[PDB]
Amino acid sequence: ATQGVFTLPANTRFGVTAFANSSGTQTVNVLVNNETAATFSGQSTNNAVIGTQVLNSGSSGKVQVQVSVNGRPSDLVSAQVILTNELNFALVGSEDGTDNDYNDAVVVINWPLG
Amino acid sequence: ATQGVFTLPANTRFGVTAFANSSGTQTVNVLVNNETAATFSGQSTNNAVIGTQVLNSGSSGKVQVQVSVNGRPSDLVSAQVILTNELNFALVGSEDGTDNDYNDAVVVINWPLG
Amino acid sequence: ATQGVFTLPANTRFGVTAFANSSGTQTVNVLVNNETAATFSGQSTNNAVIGTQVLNSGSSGKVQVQVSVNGRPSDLVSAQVILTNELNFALVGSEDGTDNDYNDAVVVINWPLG
Amino acid sequence: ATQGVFTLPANTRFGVTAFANSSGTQTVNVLVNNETAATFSGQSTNNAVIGTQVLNSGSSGKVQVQVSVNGRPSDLVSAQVILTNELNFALVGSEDGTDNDYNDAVVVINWPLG
Amino acid sequence: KPXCXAXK
Numbered sequence: 037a038t039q040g041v042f043t044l045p046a047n048t049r050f051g052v053t054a055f056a057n058s059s060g061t062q063t064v065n066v067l068v069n070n071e072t073a074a075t076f077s078g079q080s081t082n083n084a085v086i087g088t089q090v091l092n093s094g095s096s097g098k099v100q101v102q103v104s105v106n107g108r109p110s111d112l113v114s115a116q117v118i119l120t121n122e123l124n125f126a127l128v129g130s131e132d133g134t135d136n137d138y139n140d141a142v143v144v145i146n147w148p149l150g
Numbered sequence: 151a152t153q154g155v156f157t158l159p160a161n162t163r164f165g166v167t168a169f170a171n172s173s174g175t176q177t178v179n180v181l182v183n184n185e186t187a188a189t190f191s192g193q194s195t196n197n198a199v200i201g202t203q204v205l206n207s208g209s210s211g212k213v214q215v216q217v218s219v220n221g222r223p224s225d226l227v228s229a230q231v232i233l234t235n236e237l238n239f240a241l242v243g244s245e246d247g248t249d250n251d252y253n254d255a256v257v258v259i260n261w262p263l264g
Numbered sequence: 265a266t267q268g269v270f271t272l273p274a275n276t277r278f279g280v281t282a283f284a285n286s287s288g289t290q291t292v293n294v295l296v297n298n299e300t301a302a303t304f305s306g307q308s309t310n311n312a313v314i315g316t317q318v319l320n321s322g323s324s325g326k327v328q329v330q331v332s333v334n335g336r337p338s339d340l341v342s343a344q345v346i347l348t349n350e351l352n353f354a355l356v357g358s359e360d361g362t363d364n365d366y367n368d369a370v371v372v373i374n375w376p377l378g
Numbered sequence: 379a380t381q382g383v384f385t386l387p388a389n390t391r392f393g394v395t396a397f398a399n400s401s402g403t404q405t406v407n408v409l410v411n412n413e414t415a416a417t418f419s420g421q422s423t424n425n426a427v428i429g430t431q432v433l434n435s436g437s438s439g440k441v442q443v444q445v446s447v448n449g450r451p452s453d454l455v456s457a458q459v460i461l462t463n464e465l466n467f468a469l470v471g472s473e474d475g476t477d478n479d480y481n482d483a484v485v486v487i488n489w490p491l492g
Numbered sequence: 493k494p495x496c497x498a499x500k
């Protein structure tokens with residue numbers, strides 16, 4: 037199944053933050069309606085924050101996370117969780133290698149903000 | 151029900167990261183086996199990453215998140231989610247007022263690292 | 265925080281299924297737009313299904329689960345999870361006593377159907 | 379990533395319940411420790427409970443859900459969620475065709491029981 | 493097909 041794709045409420049601000057846990061340099065692209073809205077890059081094996089930004093889901097609401105390591109797309113796992121019918125998390129893990137820890141880039145999207 | 155308490159596997163490194171979305175100054179305390187392991191604070195209505203840290207769950211694996219505003223504990227909501235039977239997120243929202251957006255401090259714990 | 269309340273898409277069918285795990289007779293009420301749409305009562309310590317039904321979210325989309333035992337409201341915990349940006353689960357646990365297993369009545373809401 | 383495999387605590391009873399939403403007949407097999415422990419089959423477009431059973435996770439705790447339609451494996455999506463650090467749900471969706479509703483068989487595993 | 497259930 038498709039992973040890393042989330043339908044947010046249209047025209048809504050959201051936060052996106054990425055962490056790295058890999059020997060490979062992670063490139064995280066956050067797309068809004070298939071256009072790159074933020075790009076984070078960095079390397080860490082200690083969960084360093086490699087980027088954080090506030091974006092808007094825009095007129096379509098469509099948000100996608102893509103992760104690559106030196107031009108090779110990583111495999112993604114994802115889900116959305118809603119707490120108290122209000123607080124939303126869209127969560128992504130990714131795998132660039134063979135150990136299947138799925139933490140090589142970890143991406144957290146949260147809304148609403150403010 | 152109790153919220154903001156999570157049992158991690160013993161002696162496991164994990165990330166903890168806090169975001170602020172409120173006019174009130176947030177204070178986030180992270181306790182590992184009932185000892186204060188991290189304290190973050192800040193004030194943002196735009197999802198500032200007021201703290202991020204790598205901790206170790208220690209001998210018991212007990213992790214507790216507390217949130218307060220100028221000494222007033224916020225009401226917490228939380229859950230843990232596991233993707234592909236391996237990638238873990240422990241999630242906390244909190245409410246310091248009356249609008250019930252539950253985003254006033256948001257805390258994400260993630261493991262494994264590395 | 266409020267628990268057991270979920271906003272579904274309007275005019276959408278959903279499944280609701282209740283399981284019992286307690287010495288006490290569980291009564292599960294499902295409200296749609298603040299009006300009772302289904303009620304299930306039964307007793308089991310072996311996860312028996314005490315009711316399962318297809319309901320409509322109606323023009324409002326507001327769904328609330330309440331649980332009581334011998335007339336006393338149980339404490340609820342709940343969350344919603346979305347898989348592959350499509351498949352929705354609204355989950356409720358409840359506690360009628362002191363052991364805090366939160367399984368005394370368990371309610372699973374799923375959509376879409378068909 | 380692998381889907382439909384979950385590590386439960388050892389020697390723990392759990393419930394497993396399957397729903398159908400498809401024109402195709404669903405076959406759900408539930409494996410514990412790599413042995414088939416329950417099997418359900420049926421056709422519904424209205425969320426029928428095609429089976430529910432109580433199983434023991436045994437010494438391994440390894441539980442796998444497989445879904446097929448006339449012998450053809452469906453594509454699975456899955457996650458595990460924990461409420462109040464105690465109440466566990468392992469969730470599976472499956473897709474037997476091309477519309478990607480992922481509800482064609484839905485499987486919910488819950489523990490603890492009793 | 494149709495009327496006897498034949499299909500998928």
Ligand SMILES: *C(=O)C[C@@H]1O[C@@H](C)[C@@H](O)[C@@H](O)[C@@H]1O
Nearest residue numbers: 057058059132133135137264
């Ligand atoms: C490359 O060595 C593999 C890569 O980096 C490792 C240190 C580890 O984080 C692994 O999960 C990742 O795929």
Ligand SMILES: *C(=O)C[C@@H]1O[C@@H](C)[C@@H](O)[C@@H](O)[C@@H]1O
Nearest residue numbers: 150171172173174247249251
């Ligand atoms: C006022 O202090 C309330 C407070 O700050 C608002 C800007 C908003 O974030 C609200 O959710 C928060 O409780």
Ligand SMILES: *C(=O)C[C@@H]1O[C@@H](C)[C@@H](O)[C@@H](O)[C@@H]1O
Nearest residue numbers: 285286287360361363365492
């Ligand atoms: C005891 O009566 C309390 C009650 O029933 C038990 C068998 C157990 O299921 C417990 O969780 C429930 O609260």
Ligand SMILES: *C(=O)C[C@@H]1O[C@@H](C)[C@@H](O)[C@@H](O)[C@@H]1O
Nearest residue numbers: 378399400401402475477479
């Ligand atoms: C076969 O026609 C497709 C199949 O059954 C449909 C009624 C619908 O439930 C679809 O999601 C499923 O894949």
Ligand SMILES: [Ca+2]
Nearest residue numbers: 133136137138
């Ligand atoms: Ca890896």
Ligand SMILES: [Ca+2]
Nearest residue numbers: 057137140264
């Ligand atoms: Ca890694």
Ligand SMILES: [Ca+2]
Nearest residue numbers: 250251252254
């Ligand atoms: Ca608030």
Ligand SMILES: [Ca+2]
Nearest residue numbers: 150171172254
């Ligand atoms: Ca707020």
Ligand SMILES: [Ca+2]
Nearest residue numbers: 360361365366
């Ligand atoms: Ca109980």
Ligand SMILES: [Ca+2]
Nearest residue numbers: 285286368492
């Ligand atoms: Ca019980």
Ligand SMILES: [Ca+2]
Nearest residue numbers: 478479480482
């Ligand atoms: Ca389908």
Ligand SMILES: [Ca+2]
Nearest residue numbers: 378399400482
């Ligand atoms: Ca279907």
